[PDB]
Amino acid sequence: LADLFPGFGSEWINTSSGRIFARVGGDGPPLLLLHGFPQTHVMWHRVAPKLAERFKVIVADLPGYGWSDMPESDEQHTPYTKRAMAKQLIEAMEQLGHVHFALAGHNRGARVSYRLALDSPGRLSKLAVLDILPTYEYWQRMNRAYALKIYHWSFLAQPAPLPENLLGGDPDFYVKAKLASWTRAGDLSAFDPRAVEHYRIAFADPMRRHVMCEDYRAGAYADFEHDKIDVEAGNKIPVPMLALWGASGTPLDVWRKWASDVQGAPIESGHFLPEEAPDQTAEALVRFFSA
Amino acid sequence: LADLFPGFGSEWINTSSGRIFARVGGDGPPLLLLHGFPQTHVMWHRVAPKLAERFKVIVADLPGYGWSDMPESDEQHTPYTKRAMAKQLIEAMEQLGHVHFALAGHNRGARVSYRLALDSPGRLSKLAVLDILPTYEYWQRMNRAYALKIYHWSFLAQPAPLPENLLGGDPDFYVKAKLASWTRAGDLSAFDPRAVEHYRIAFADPMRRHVMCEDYRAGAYADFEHDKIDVEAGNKIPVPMLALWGASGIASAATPLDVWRKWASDVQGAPIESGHFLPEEAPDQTAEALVRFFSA
Ligand SMILES: [Ca+2]
Ligand SMILES: [Cl-]
Ligand SMILES: [Cl-]
Ligand SMILES: [Cl-]
Ligand SMILES: [Cl-]
C-alpha cells in the first residue's frame, strides 16, 4: 500500500468509541476532510496538498472505515448513524485541540458533515459537501428512476446477512463496479491505481463490509428520522456552506432549504470529485475556506 | 429430481422462440398454469391434482425457466418481456390445439398472464392472477418504505453483470432465503423439500440466473412501458378475472382488488391467509378458489 500523502504525518486519535486514523499535514486554520463509500481517507490524495498550502489538514477514516477502529453496532445501527459518527469525530478533533474547525465531506462523509452542522453548529467555521443531497431528500425522491439509479441504498440496507453474504463472493468486483459506475468515464481510469488498491484492500475484509452495510442501514432508518425531525422543525444549518456537485453526479435549491448561507457550483465530473476533477475541486475549496 | 405430478404426461413444445416444457394431465376445458420467480412449474404440484379432476391442466415452465429453452436476450431484454413471453406461450398452446383457454398465473407468470389478456384477450376465457399487482402499479407506488420492503426489483434490474456476479458466489443461500422470506412463517416449512430442490437446481445454473435478471430488467423497463401505455390509454382487461392474494404476501394501501378494478372491467377477488406462495402455503383454498372461478 502506497503512501499518497507527501509530508503528512499519520495519527491514531483516541475517542470514547475507538480510534480514528488520520493523515495530518500543513499548518494554519484547521480543516477536517471526510471520505465516503466505498473509499477511505486516501480519496483526498490529489487535493489535500493544495489545501495544506493554507490549512492544517486532517484526513480521517470515518468510524469503522479504513484503519479506524470498528465500534460494536446494535439493533439501531447506532455507532454508524451520522449523528454518532459526528460525535465521535468531534471527540477526535478535541484530542487535537480543535473545537472550531473547517469541514469538507464527500458521500457518507458529507452526511456526517451536514449532521455535525445541524447538531453542533458551533464546532464549524465553514462546511463543504461534495455531490450529495440530504438523506431525507434522496428518500423523498425515491421513485422508480431513483430506486434504479440508487439501488444500493435499499440493497445494502436489507437485514443482515443478506448483503454481507452476497458481497462475500467477489468483493473486488463490487468495489470496482461501484467506483467505475459513478464516474463520468464509467471505468477506473480517473483513479490512481494505488488508491484503488487501498479501496480494494479495505473492501476485502468482511468486517469492514459489515460496517458499510450498518452505515447504509442507518441511512435507511435513524439517519432518515433524524433528518425528518429537522425538516419538520424547519431547522436550517447556520454555518457558511458550499455545495459542490458533479455535472454527471438543482442541488443548490435543495441545500437552500436546509441551510441559511449556502453557495454552490457544478464541477465537470462524475461523483468522485476529488479524483475525477482534482484541480477544480481543490481550487473551489481553497477559495471558499480562505474567504 | 422428483416427479411431483405422478400420472401427468411431459411435453417439450416447440415454438418459434424455443421449447416450452410442460406437465399435462386431467381432462376437460384447457387450463394453463404459470409459475414465477424463483420457482419452476413444480410450484403447482399441490393444486394440480385437484384442478386435474375438472380441467385439462397444462403446467408450463416460463420461457427461460426450468427446462424451457433460454433464448439469447438483447439490449431491451425482449424475449423476457411479458409481451414476448405471452406470445411464446400462445404459440405453445396452439401446438396443443388450444386457441381459447383459461389461465392462472403467479408472480412473473401472473404478469405474463395479464399482459396476455391486454394484448390478446380473445385467447382467454378467464384469467386468475395470484399475489401480484400490475408492474406499472408496483413502480408507481415506489417510495422509501416499498423500496426497503421489496428491494429485489431494483437490485436484479441492475445492468449485467452486477446481480449475476453477486448471486454466483452462493446461489443456494439466496434462493432459499427468498423462498423463506416471502412465506407467512418466514421459513421453508410451507414447501415440499423435493420442490425446494427443483428450485435450487434451476437457480444453480448461471444461465438460468441470467434469465431471471433479464426478466427483472424487462420488469423495470419495457414491461413497465407497455403497462404505462395501457393505463394512460384507459385500457382495461375485458376477460373475466380473479385476483387472489396473500394477506402477508407481496401485493399497496388499497387492497389488491381495488388496484385491479382500475385495470380490469370484470374482476373479483379475495385474500387468503398466506404469504406469497399461495399454491404451496394454502393449497386447498387456492385450488378451491380456482376450480370455483373457472367452473362457474
Ligand atoms: Ca406441431
Ligand atoms: Cl452518499
Ligand atoms: Cl445524495
Ligand atoms: Cl406486485
Ligand atoms: Cl389451504
Side-chain angles (χ1 to χ4, degrees), chain A residues 15-81:
Chain A
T15 80
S16 80
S17 294
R19 306 171 300 156
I20 298 291
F21 180 77
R23 299 302 300 276
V24 186
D27 53 78
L31 169 69
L32 181 57
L33 296 184
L34 298 180
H35 74 90
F37 167 91
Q39 301 194 297
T40 70
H41 65 276
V42 302
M43 57 79 40
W44 298 102
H45 78 105
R46 285 182 172 122
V47 306
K50 276 91 152 285
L51 283 159
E53 296 182 343
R54 304 248 200 139
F55 306 107
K56 179 187 176 183
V57 180
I58 303 133
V59 194
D61 289 331
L62 293 177
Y65 281 71
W67 302 321
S68 294
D69 286 345
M70 296 172 271
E72 182 149 50
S73 200
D74 66 19
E75 296 186 73
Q76 284 74 37
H77 321 297
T78 309
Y80 307 109
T81 68

Side-chain angles (χ1 to χ4, degrees), chain B residues 33-101:
Chain B
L33 302 176
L34 304 179
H35 71 89
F37 172 95
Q39 305 193 293
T40 67
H41 76 279
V42 306
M43 52 76 78
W44 302 92
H45 74 101
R46 313 282 307 279
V47 306
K50 189 91 192 229
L51 292 164
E53 299 167 20
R54 308 175 115 97
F55 298 101
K56 183 80 192 176
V57 179
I58 307 96
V59 199
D61 285 329
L62 286 184
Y65 283 77
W67 296 337
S68 293
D69 283 342
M70 302 176 274
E72 186 176 358
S73 197
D74 71 12
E75 291 174 344
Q76 291 74 53
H77 323 295
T78 310
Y80 300 109
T81 61
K82 311 305 160 283
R83 170 166 288 154
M85 293 182 172
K87 288 175 185 171
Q88 181 169 5
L89 283 158
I90 283 167
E91 291 189 36
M93 288 290 276
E94 283 211 357
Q95 291 282 301
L96 307 179
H98 308 314
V99 301
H100 191 73
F101 53 87

Side-chain angles (χ1 to χ4, degrees), chain A residues 139 142-144 147-149 151 153-155 157-159 161-162 165-167 169-170 173-174 177-178 220-221 224-225, chain B residues 139-140 142-144 147-149 151 153-155 157-158 161-162 165-167 169-170 173-174 177-178 220-221 224-225:
Chain A
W139 288 113
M142 197 77 53
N143 64 5
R144 164 177 164 269
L148 291 165
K149 196 198 154 132
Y151 89 92
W153 280 44
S154 294
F155 166 63
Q158 290 306 296
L162 180 155
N165 174 85
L166 291 168
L167 291 175
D170 192 350
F173 165 89
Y174 194 78
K178 288 293 168 275
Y221 292 104
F224 172 68
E225 298 294 356
Chain B
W139 286 118
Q140 289 292 117
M142 178 60 66
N143 63 14
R144 162 179 169 275
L148 283 172
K149 215 329 154 287
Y151 80 99
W153 280 48
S154 300
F155 172 65
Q158 297 300 306
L162 182 136
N165 286 352
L166 285 171
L167 290 172
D170 192 352
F173 187 98
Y174 189 81
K178 282 295 177 288
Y221 294 110
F224 169 75
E225 292 297 337

